[PDB]
């Protein structure tokens, strides 16, 4: 779903939501992948959208 | 709701110059062959 996911991220950013996705944050994610995932999984305030 | 039409994200791709890049060159010295009549050391002996 990569293409539609990019479109969805465009939509969310345009509507004012700060979206975290691997392809756009590839630098900080590249520093440490697991730490990057944990940073967003720990935080209760972050809302997670699951692309089925 | 707003539409990303104007604000769409941007992908990036470098303009690689590899198509016109020079190659790495290996040097080999042209040995003066001993197969050809190269000189030799004149180990001398004495007839006493």
Whether the CB-CB separation of A51 and A5 falls below 8 Å is answered with yes
Half-sphere exposure of B9 (CA within 13 A, CB side): 17
Q: With an 8 Å Cβ cutoff, is A9 touching chain B?
A: yes
Residues of A in contact with B1 (CB under 8 A): 15
Alpha-carbon distances, residue A12 vs A31, A38, B2, B9 (angstroms): 25, 22, 9, 11
| Experimental technique behind these coordinates | cryo-EM
Taking only residues 20 to 49 of chain A, the set having a beta carbon closer than 8 angstroms to any beta carbon of chain B reads 24
Residues 6+ apart with CB under 8 A from A7: B4
Q: A7 contacts in B (CB within 8 Å)?
A: 4
Task: Find the angle CA(A24)-CA(A22)-CA(A51) to the nearest 5 degrees.
Answer: 110
Residue of B nearest to A11 (CA): B4
On chain A, the residues whose CB falls within 8 A of the CB of B7 are 10, 13-14
């Amino acid at each position: 779903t990569a293409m539609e996911v990019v479109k969805f991220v465009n939509f969310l950013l345009v509507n004012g939501f700060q979206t975290a996705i691997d392809i756009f944050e590839d630098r900080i994610r590249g520093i440490d992948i697991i730490k990057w995932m944990e940073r967003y999984l720990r935080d209760k305030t972050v809302m997670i959208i699951v692309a089925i | 709701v707003r539409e990303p039409g104007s604000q769409a994200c941007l992908a990036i791709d470098p303009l690689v110059g590899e198509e016109g890049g020079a190659a790495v060159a290996k040097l080999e010295p042209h040995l003066q062959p001993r197969g050809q009549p190269a000189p030799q050391p004149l180990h001398t002996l004495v007839l006493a």
